[PDB]
Amino acid sequence: AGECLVVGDSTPIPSIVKLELPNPEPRSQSIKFHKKWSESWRTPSFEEVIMRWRKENG
Amino acid sequence: YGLSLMVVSQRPSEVSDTILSQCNNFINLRLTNINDQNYIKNLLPDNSRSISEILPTLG
Amino acid sequence: RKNQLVPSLNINSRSRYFIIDPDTIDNFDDEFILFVKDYLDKYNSKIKLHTETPCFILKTDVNNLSEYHKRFVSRNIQIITGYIGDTFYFKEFNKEPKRIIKDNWVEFKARISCNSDEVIKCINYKKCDDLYIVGGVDVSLLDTADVNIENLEINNFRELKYLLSMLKEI
């Protein structure tokens, strides 16, 4: 994790590089299923989602 | 978008390769078919390709 | 302090010398033998990889070394002192123990001696790797050329065991 293999014309010896961490960092679009399943029951807006389904056909 | 799959099959070699290749976790029980064993070993990471020989003898 | 000494205390073939003042620590005369006994079972147990003998130098008189020697003998621990009566012998102190691997036998497992001019000269002849001064000693006639001089301060043998990673609690 965080290590990249650099192979190309810009280097004479291909090698593994430990890349640092960005500052600031990009947004992470990951959903943690277990932590979301450990909360109380969630009731979504069923009317809004079907309205978007109907309207966004093109 | 918030979906996950759990593919259960006693003949892994007959399941679509496009779907079985996206699985990251494997819960392998006893397997008695050579083709299924080879397919599972190919899917499994190299970190477990040495312990994968215990599949036919699983209790 | 404990976490600073772990990298050095993890090498099997590493010489460690001790310079201990009996007066600084409490109940020295009744727990030093136990400290040696449970130091060698951890750091000088392997017959092939633990190939260097620890040296314990005590700031005391020669007449008190015979009591320590006989107390060690009573507990079935083989040590050498270099003194027989009141005469120090250079060859006996600096001799290398003989090992029989198939029998798991080594002729002695520690060099326990007193602080004296003759003994200090022997230490300088065969330099060690780590030197642990405990309680505060002069150490002005010892060649500290390429030897770590880690000073350990304690008040009881439990603290020394905790520092030397021989006990998980203080």
Place this chain on the structure above:
Amino acid sequence: KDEDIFILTVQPVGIFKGEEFFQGNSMLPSPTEPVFLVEDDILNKIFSNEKTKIFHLG
């Protein structure tokens, strides 16, 4: 032929430097070094650990 051979082939899967487990094939042990089975105290740190995101599987 009166030759007692009892040889086990093992494979390193990590290290136990301190009170925590680090994976990786490194720090090859020196010859004539004892093997001490494995105790439940150290196996309870590799797997069980301690965190909110813990899922028991037997």
